[PDB]
């Protein structure tokens, strides 16, 4: 719900902006697609996109240590 660590997930749960969204990293031999996919209502797409893009920008400009540690733990758990 609204207590999700991911700020985008928390916003989506709070505002009912998205039925389901997920980030993907589909790698190929020399290229790949890095991004997100979401399912939204007619009147929500814009907002969701906004927040999604904002999230990216945060990581590009202001990424903190605690959230990076959480992401590393998530990646370790996914790998194992």
């Amino acid at each position: 719900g609204t207590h999700m660590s991911s700020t985008l997930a928390s916003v989506a749960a709070t505002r009912k902006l998205c039925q389901s969204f997920q980030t993907f990293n589909i790698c190929y031999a020399e290229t790949g697609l890095l991004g997100a996919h979401f399912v939204c209502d007619n009147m929500s797409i814009d907002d969701m996109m906004f927040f999604l893009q904002g999230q990216w920008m945060r990581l590009c400009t202001s990424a903190t240590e605690s959230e990076v540690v959480r992401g590393k733990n998530i990646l370790r758990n996914a790998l194992v």
Partner: protein, 79 residues
């Protein structure tokens, strides 16, 4: 009321676009622009110009007629 999301109902229309940083801002500006301008001019020249041509004819006649009116009339000073 009038916002993107409920303006109209459209189905089965696929649109393909391109990034503005992947395409040229002036693609075939003269090779295709100049023929297109001529086509547009030709389609409109016979609906826009003829009224203005009439004005030019009226303007010239009025200017000439006004000049002629101010000119001296020799017959008036005869006798």
């Amino acid at each position: 009321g009038r916002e993107f999301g409920h303006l109209t109902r459209m189905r089965h229309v696929i649109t393909y676009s391109l990034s503005p940083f992947e395409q040229r801002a002036f693609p075939h500006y003269f090779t295709k622009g100049i023929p297109n301008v001529l086509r547009r001019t030709r389609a409109c020249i016979l609906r826009v110009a003829p009224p203005f041509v009439v004005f030019y004819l009226v303007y010239t006649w009025g200017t000439q007629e006004f000049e002629k009116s101010k000119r001296k009339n020799p017959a008036a000073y005869e006798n």
